[PDB]
Amino acid sequence: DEERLAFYRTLYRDHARYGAALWLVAANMASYSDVDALVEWIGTEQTE
Amino acid sequence: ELIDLVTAELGADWPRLVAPVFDPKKAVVFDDRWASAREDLVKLWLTD
Amino acid sequence: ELIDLVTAELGADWPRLVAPVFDPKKAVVFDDRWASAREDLVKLWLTD
After folding, report:
1. Do B27 and A24 touch (CB under 8 A)?
2. Between chains, do A26 and B26 touch, taking CB under 8 Å as contact?
3. How many CA atoms lie within 13 A of C43 on its CB side?
4. What is the DSSP letter of A19?
5. Residue A20: helix, strand or coil by DSSP?
6. Which of A42, A46, C14, C44 could be joined to C10 by an S-S link, Cβ 3.0–4.6 Å?
7. CA trace torsion A31, A33, A35, A36 (10° rounding)
């Protein structure tokens, strides 16, 4: 949401350096469906 | 029968504790450093 | 939705692995020793 989005954005703009990138996803860590979808997302690409 | 089976075995709030959250359209990328670098160059001039 | 939720999280055969078996009408009591004692007295005479 808005609070956490502002938090992670200020975290990046404070502590970032050379070629650093931060990706941010919403995933429940108590669901095997979410763990499988998360590893598929980190695996194959996403082209919208 | 199935829902009070799950209520007796696991818990009453099991589907909301286990419900999937992940969706690949909501991923957020934070890889802008040159722009925040230029703005930080400005506010270094503004600070005394 | 709920059954394939349970299929993705726990397993396909979860209700038959977890299904209740107990029923108090099917309890079996084995407290007869005097009768089997008398029959064993007989078969001690039958054995040589």
Report:
1. yes
2. yes
3. 5
4. T
5. coil
6. C14
7. 160
Name the amino acid, one letter, at B16: R
Q: Closest approach of chain C CAs to the CA of A3, in angstroms?
A: 30
Please name the method used to determine this structure.
Answer: cryo-EM
Place of tokens 């990046």: A12
Contacts of C9 in chain A (CB under 8 A): 31-33
Two structure tokens written together for B11? 């818990």
Amino acid type, B44: L
For residue B27 the two structure tokens come to 């991923």
Residue C23, Cα to own-chain centre: how many angstroms?
Answer: 11
Place of tokens 């099917």: C26
Structure tokens at B18: 């286990």
Q: Hey, what amino acid is at C30?
A: F
